[PDB]
Structure formats: structure tokens, C-alpha cells
UniProtKB/TrEMBL annotation:
Transmembrane segments: none annotated. Residues 118-220 form the Staphylococcal/Streptococcal toxin beta-grasp domain. It comes from the Bacteria. The lineage of its organism: Bacteria, Bacillati, Bacillota, Bacilli, Bacillales. It holds the Pfam family Stap_Strp_toxin. This is Staphylococcal enterotoxin B. Belongs to the staphylococcal/streptococcal toxin family. Residues 22-106 form the Staphylococcal/Streptococcal toxin OB-fold domain. GO terms for cellular component: extracellular region. Disulfide bonds join C92-C99.
């Protein structure tokens, strides 16, 4: 449904002179993952606040999901959900609280027996040289979760974002569900700055897909 990237539409990493590590921390080993949690508070009319704890490093004790509109926050307000996504900030109104976008799926009637695998084909400058699987136990899973899994594998194995500079010039991730498909630009906007919240704001739609039918294709050009 979404048209594929037009010529020169993708972001060039060479036109980005900031620190690539900023984007790297978004898809490193650390993210927000919670199972069977209900909202506890609400700051603004398009967010929800969850008592999600950082068992890893103890950084955050509360997490604030931001949505694109109000119907999403009012939707998942009183429902027990699972949370999965990339956190970016540490704010106050004790431990601090971190923020993210979307990544909320309903719990009941959404868990699978075994781990469902999704195959990811990677194309470097045109040729399919790499292909790996990403697992999930969710019938309906956010595109943010699959994107974070894919980009995480690419972080650790192919050095997609390193601390300084990037080996890859352009790159976008493509989710194809049956007939329809959409894509996301993986490279930061040009300039010396990089706003984590503005980049991650693309996830505020809470776009979900079916793990049985979705297919993932990553396209990178050096």
C-alpha cells in the first residue's frame, strides 16, 4: 500500500555529522519489555503511565507510552497489555521515568504456544547476502518490536550503527503483510543533531501486524 522509497527519498548517513551512537543506543541490548501490565496514571491525554521496572540496571521505575492520538490512549487505558519498545529519555514528574512510543499489545488471546519465527532477508546494494530469523510469542505484534529485533541483530552482527560513522549509506526496513506493505527509514535526518524522540515518534501509531503472515525485508546501500 505504501509506495516504496522514491529516488533520493532515503536519508544519507554521510549527510549526518552527529554522533551515530545516539541512534545506536535505541537498538542495543536495552529496551522496555513488560508482560501483563495495566496503566497506573496518565500525564497527558495521549500518553499512558505504566509501573514497569528496570530489573536490568534499575534506571527507571515508571514508563510513559506516547500515542499519535487520543483514541489509542483511551483504548489501552484500562486494558492489561504487554509493552515492548525503545526508550529514549529520563524525566521527572525516587527513581526517574523513561518515555517511549506505542509498542502496546493486548495480553489476553494474544500469546502463542511456541516461539513464532519471522524470516528477515537483507540486501546489500542489491544482492541478498544475509537472512536471519526473529522470534515472538505474539499473534499481533507491533512493527516497533520486529524492527527493534531486526535492527538489533544488525547492530551486533553487521555493525549497522557504530559509535562513529556508519558503513551503510542508506537503509530502510519493509514490513509486508499479505498484499499490503509499509517501510521505515533507518538512517537519521541530515545535520549535526539527532532528536531521539522525533525519530522514535514514528512508532506512536501502534501499528501491529500478524506474526503468521508478516515478512521483513531490509534494504541497505553502501
Amino acid at each position: 500500500s505504501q509506495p516504496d522509497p522514491k529516488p533520493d527519498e532515503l536519508h544519507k548517513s554521510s549527510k549526518f555529522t552527529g554522533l551515530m551512537e545516539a541512534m545506536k543506543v535505541l537498538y542495543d541490548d536495552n529496551h522496555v519489555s513488560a508482560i501483563n501490565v495495566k496503566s497506573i496514571d496518565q500525564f497527558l491525554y495521549f500518553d499512558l503511565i505504566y509501573s514497569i521496572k528496570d530489573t536490568k540496571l534499575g534506571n527507571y521505575d515508571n514508563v510513559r507510552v506516547e500515542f499519535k492520538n487520543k483514541d489509542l490512549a483511551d483504548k489501552y487505558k484500562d486494558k492489561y497489555v504487554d509493552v515492548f519498545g525503545a526508550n529514549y529519555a529520563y524525566q521527572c514528574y525516587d527513581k526517574a521515568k523513561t518515555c517511549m512510543y506505542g509498542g502496546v499489545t493486548e495480553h489476553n488471546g494474544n500469546q502463542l504456544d511456541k516461539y513464532r519465527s519471522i524470516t528477515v532477508r537483507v540486501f546489500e546494494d542489491g544482492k541478498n547476502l544475509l537472512s536471519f530469523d526473529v522470534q515472538t510469542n505474539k499473534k499481533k505484534v507491533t512493527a516497533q518490536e520486529l524492527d527493534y529485533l531486526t535492527r538489533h541483530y544488525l547492530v551486533k552482527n553487521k555493525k549497522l550503527y557504530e559509535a562513529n560513522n556508519s558503513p551503510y549509506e542508506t537503509g530502510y526496513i519493509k514490513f509486508i503483510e499479505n498484499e499490503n506493505s509499509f517501510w521505515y527509514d533507518m538512517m537519521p535526518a541530515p545535520g549535526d543533531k539527532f532528536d531521539q524522540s522525533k525519530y522514535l515518534m514514528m512508532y506512536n501509531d501502534n501499528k501491529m501486524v500478524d506474526s503468521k503472515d508478516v515478512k521483513i525485508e531490509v534494504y541497505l546501500t553502501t
